[PDB]
Symmetry: D2
Subunit: 497 residues, 4 copies
């Protein structure tokens, strides 16, 4: 019997043809070294499906350019690249430093103020932290984690109402404006602060496709986001970023009430042990798989390619095992944001994603997933899992989903067929929005030009002809056609003509 | 965990409402006590779906009458009753006896002859056997089996070219013209005798729906029967009767080449031990479910109700278990042909079938069958097996299968959904012909009167309405629609 | 190879029968089989359990059965269990003038509780032994005489002891027949004062098990136990399920008793016959998962009471009782008053052997396995993991050392595809194991052949039996198990 | 609840870590961990195997490694395995004047086989030790240098010993680096004269296992056993899979060797990085199914050679080596020339502990069982059934009496959710089990504490170890097993 992965690894051979449709999706973070149309085209061409604007930095005019360029680059290449707005959030940062940085030393005693006068002239003996309620929330004995939690200062006493005496436990030199975390204090900051509310309204007007919501801990907080986007942005997706343990603990309620998860390894790892982050990843990705919402593998992906032409052995296994975990998206930050090799990172990630995938036990995923759905299931759920089951039964070589919001294509993608899925939509912003779901590819069908398509056949042909041109289907091959969402519900098996 | 029948048994309570819609189908043998339109109406009304005509008896005129009445009775009630023409076959029989019977006592010597002169005036001391090359095929020491093999004669020598000296081993008294079996001789008779060919042509002209071909041993003999049916009957269903051990052996090549099987326990029992025949049944019924072609639990069904008002505690278990094995159909012979209780026999069998069926693990069938299909499967095969899988996932209280030849209805029927299957046909014969396939009902759709229906949605509506008015589905209930040959599945939210 | 259906495709009727019947046969003793010569025949035809029906005959009569069975079995060097089937809360009609009655339909008739009318009853007025009948019966209620194929309907009280009754179903009735009262409180004690003495008789005579009649409560079993005394703590209690009051309770009744008997006939009194079949499946599958013995009970090979061969259906009935999962099949009238007691059993052997050797053995082991609460008790794991070892090695026999039978019964629970050979110091264990399928019991006399502190001697005797019955040869594998402490060997039969 | 996906849904990181590390850690001893003081520290941090890399250093040197490992583990009263990793058919470049070369791009450079260039090479012409190099290479061929990251193209033969080469890739290369020749029959024998001598030294010093290099062929393993000779028959042969010829022949190789090491580094030379990941899965799962130890091998925690903390990716990579199914993880240079040798092992242990205590155990047990041929031999079944018992009973530890250690190794194969405690009279079994996951050895001296014929003393010692490690308590169940015969017990720990 060919039950589960172990059984499957025994057949696999690396010398066999790399089965060619890359399911996994790549997000890049745009920044100084990739903002230009020209360099964006390269990103698209290397394998980007999502541009990620990071609102922790840059004016609106900045991001506005990133928005205009992405659109133009994409239009020139004739593809659809989803734009994502990534929330600043309830961030806590240190001030700047005189000279480059600090040089925090071990034995050292140092001072930390919430006095803004020390922002523009920070020093390694005393520096700024922008969290105004710092000295009203911290006791002596507590630690302040700085710079990805790699620098730890214990708090010793209150120098003044605004300044903190601090011992320096760890030691390492640190750059301008770094990530501060206060374990064991209620950080009162709201998940959608004054700035975010205006950042998110900017995103709605500009027609972003999704939000990457930073530091979500509450099921209730995802609510504050939805509300701040307003009804004029009821259709924009909310992809919650899990960054702290409060978020892991509340993953279920957060998933039940969101559109997807980004598993932010870097941040979790600030106060979660690095080895436990590995498990955390597995748990998060799989909860998402089961729920059928998109999940993104987060930070420190191919980290060495920010400054080197070739990634390290380990970095590679990290990407591969991310796919194996069951990731929809892998993502790059600095590597493409400020990196010295923006095309090469994306290309190489694409290759690793392609490989890993073609070695996965595609089936088990489906079977495992089916076995966990509550029966009796909703028509459209059954409609999809049966279609996927049909793919497997017939060895069908492509699926054509006619989907208009994405619901269907996303709920099919849930059941992991061993073939490419081709989504055909009259909504362009669906094409974009399906760039975070694995294995789906979107073919736009223009209802303004090519008619209303009542008989629904014109759109199905459009899907097959695409599938045909991509190499998925040849005259003879089978093809599972599905439509879900009183009509709705419908599946054909087509003989590709 | 709930994997198989044992698990399922622990939850069942006999006191629970009996899931209505008897899946199994009933075949009756028409004869003197059921030929009247009047009696046939009661038979139909009692639970009959298939009227079997046994051509081992009666002129064409007799069966013309059977057909005419079966038809008119059914037409009057507004139902579709399939007519089976049961082949005579390669039958060996004895002649007649002076007075009712024989009276074979034990160590007695008797003479068996192939001389037709003795056919009308036979005796316990010497009588006729119609198979002409009897003497030319039998060695001394062979047993001659008579009357469902309950009387065994041993052959001692040839008295002349036409007569055999026989010793009597079993003692029983025997009626006129009983079945004769010769174990261990080449019974050279054709599987389609010259008489069979005319009977079969008579079948094609009167528009029978199927042949119940007796004594099939070959892959190739099923051919012989089709070639005899001619091209004007290219559509008539051949059901192969498995009646002997040469038959069980070749069951596989036979199934692969026929439209269905009848497990004739009585005839298998002539020279296979009863206990073995039980297992034979089990094999043949499962071999047919996986093959997806009909199977009929054949003989001696509810036997004592030929002449008693109520059947025996055993006869019932025997029926219950027939449905449990996975039979499509249950057939009566003597009970309805000559029977003193033709209605009550069908009603009781109706009731037993409903009960057993409603206590069977429907799912374990589906899955067990799904996991025995060689992948990759042909589109419609998958389309159906997944359409069923859709049912179990949604607890859909009905299915609507639009099928023209019955192929699709039959292929869904194979995967045992736990609900009524409602077929819609634009061919009337498909309605009759589906009466041997389990848990399916047919709604006819007159493409002549009600339009040719392109969008195939007028037809669905009808299939749904039926289901709605049979009690199967209401507003809110889910319903699975399927058409194959092509390929299309909907899940309807019945309004 | 998941399920039976899949397995059925591979079977062939022309393949040799695997020689070892696993199901066990119980025969009821009566006039035609009480003699040592008749019992010898019965044993050799394949009887495993002498059933004494205490509804009929004195102790002296039953004493004779007990003495004669013992003497028969001994002469053949075999061990035969002895069941004391209980009378219980029976209601019977009185006697009749001339053979029977002949109840015709539209007839009005009279049913008394007055004892005077016992030995001289007619079809116009006849006795019923239930004293409180008239006090528990509203007019309109049906009375069910004779396995409930004669249905009276009550019309009024002619007096305190007599009921006016209209006759519904018309069929003639013999002497003294089973009366049943649907929808009344039959106040009859499960263990009655006459039953008390009966049970104690069995305790003194060393019967091996009781077939307690008409069990309705988990508690009623208690009544049987409390009456067997502390001197009969070892006697097995098999509950007979004879009514819907006991089908509904089957669950708690299994959890308390030592095993079930599925009395199809007496269930069939008011439960429609078709359902009885399903009830049969449920009870057997329930006992099976519980790992306690279950007997398919009445109306078995019913025509072989007067005929030399059974009816087609009477065969399927037996065959299906084995597939259903039963440990035992029973014969009542067929062996008790039958004309062909030997031939009756000899078919039942043959049918059992046939059914049993076509029955997918694995699907059982797996089905029961996948229904046990985890974590399971050591002894439980021990056996299942041994039966697992059996399938993994294709081991051709098992050897269980059990002193009470517990271990053997827990091995037999998980259905290996081979014989189980039990080895015991207790003789009563040999007998007691005659109702659990797939086991054969070898006596090992701790008295004459030493105590066996190594267990190595009893095991040689296990294998040696196995080897002799043609189960295992030099080369074969034998799974050796001892539970309760908790040990399992896989032997390479020398 | 079927597979990892289902199990992942339950898991939470805040559920306390299970306190037993199954994964085993091998360290390559080098110039920074050869002292007893340093070896104590390694062991204490979690090293189970000292690897002697014979590509470098004299016999004298490794003699020192052998003596110290011995003495350190004796002082700490622990049993520590000594592995001899073989040089094999290595192709290496000579030394360079200055530190190294600095290969700039499209520049012509020369390659000699002429020894007189070995000690004084330049970036313009340098030595390579393979003699038939120029007899075996065509113009148009590639010479790979330094684990792949420098590619030369052969242009023409300057002379019988010198190749003209264009430099394709630009990176500088240190002293004596590895040379590879793709699409050339590298003829060198798998066990060379120098290796033959090396192995005999191994045998004489009582190494416990060989880490044989560049194993391409099922019958090259044969050559290693021939060189080890009859005096070293009981030394294990762990074949290193290092080239693609070995990934193809893994099947024939595994079934013929004792175990597999997965040398990502050298596999990575001509096999694209992302494929190696897959080859790792394939090689690991293959061994698990075969029941032989597999070791994840190169570039493990690579940055901790120079840094006090690993990277995020390095951690993932270790973790996944456990999820993939490795028995062992190895550190090469990190403990050899490392600057944080203890901390390297410490961090590694910790990772392996985390990964494993979230690694669905039961799926391994089934994945493997459902892949063994039936009918399996008694000891196979005795072991699988034992584990099945472990699961049915939620037993908290196992105890194997195994002398050569076959049975322990063959139990570990089925992956119980408890620690395995192996008990042995043979000291060398204790060390040799240092490479199978989730097993610990207790040495039972047959010379001081009697022979123990009834095995009862040895089981006590089994359970006591268990007890003192906080695995089993007065109350918990413990599965005892001895195979090769074939006996399983479930003990209620006293």
């Amino acid at each position: 019997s060919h039950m589960s992965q172990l059984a499957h690894n025994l057949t696999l051979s690396i010398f066999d043809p790399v089965a060619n449709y890359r399911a996994a999706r790549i997000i890049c973070t745009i920044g100084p070294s990739t903002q230009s149309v020209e360099a964006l085209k390269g990103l698209i061409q290397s394998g980007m499906s999502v541009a990620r604007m990071n609102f922790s930095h840059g004016s609106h005019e900045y991001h506005q350019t990133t928005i205009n360029n992405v659109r133009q680059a994409a239009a020139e290449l004739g593809v659809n690249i989803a734009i994502a707005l990534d929330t600043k959030g309830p961030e806590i940062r240190t001030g700047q430093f005189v000279g480059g940085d600090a040089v925090m030393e071990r034995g050292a005693t140092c001072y930390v103020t919430t006095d803004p006068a020390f922002a523009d002239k920070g020093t390694k003996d005393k520096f700024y932290i922008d969290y105004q309620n710092l000295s009203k929330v911290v006791r002596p004995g507590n630690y302040i984690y700085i710079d990805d939690g790699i620098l730890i200062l214990q708090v010793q006493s209150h120098e003044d109402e605004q300044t903190l005496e601090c011992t320096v436990t760890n030691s390492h030199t640190i750059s301008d404006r770094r990530g501060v975390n206060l374990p064991g204090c209620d950080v009162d900051l709201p998940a959608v602060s004054a700035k975010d509310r205006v950042d998110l309204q900017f995103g709605v007007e500009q027609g972003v496709d999704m939000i990457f919501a930073s530091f979500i801990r509450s099921a209730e907080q995802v609510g504050d986001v939805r509300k701040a986007l307003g009804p004029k942005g009821r259709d924009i997706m909310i992809i919650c970023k899990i960054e702290n343990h409060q978020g892991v603990q509340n993953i279920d309620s957060i998933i039940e009430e969101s559109d997807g998860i980004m598993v932010a390894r870097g941040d979790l790892g600030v106060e979660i042990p690095a080895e436990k982050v590995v498990v955390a990843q597995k748990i998060l990705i799989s909860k998402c798989n089961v729920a059928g919402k998109p999940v993104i593998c987060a930070t420190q992906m191919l980290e060495s390619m920010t400054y080197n032409p070739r990634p390290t052995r380990a970095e590679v296994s990290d990407v591969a095992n991310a796919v194996f975990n069951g990731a929809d998206c892998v993502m790059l930050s600095g590597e493409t944001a400020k990196g010295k090799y923006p095309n090469e990172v994306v290309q190489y990630m694409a290759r690793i994603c392609l490989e890993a995938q073609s070695a996965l036990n595609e089936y088990v995923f489906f079977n495992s997933i089916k076995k966990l759905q509550h029966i009796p299931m909703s028509a459209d759920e059954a409609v999809c899992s049966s279609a996927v089951n049909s793919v497997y039964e017939t060895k069908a070589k492509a699926m054509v989903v006619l989907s208009n919001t994405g619901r269907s294509a996303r709920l099919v993608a849930k059941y992991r067929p061993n073939c490419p899925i081709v989504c055909v939509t009259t909504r362009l912003q669906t094409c974009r929005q399906l760039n975070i779901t694995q294995g789906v590819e979107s073919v736009f069908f223009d209802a303004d030009k090519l008619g209303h398509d009542w008989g629904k056949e014109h759109r199905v042909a459009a899907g097959v002809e695409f599938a045909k041109s991509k190499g998925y289907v040849q005259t003879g091959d089978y093809c599972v056609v599905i439509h879900a969402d009183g009509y709705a519900n419908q599946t054909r098996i087509l003989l590709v003509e």
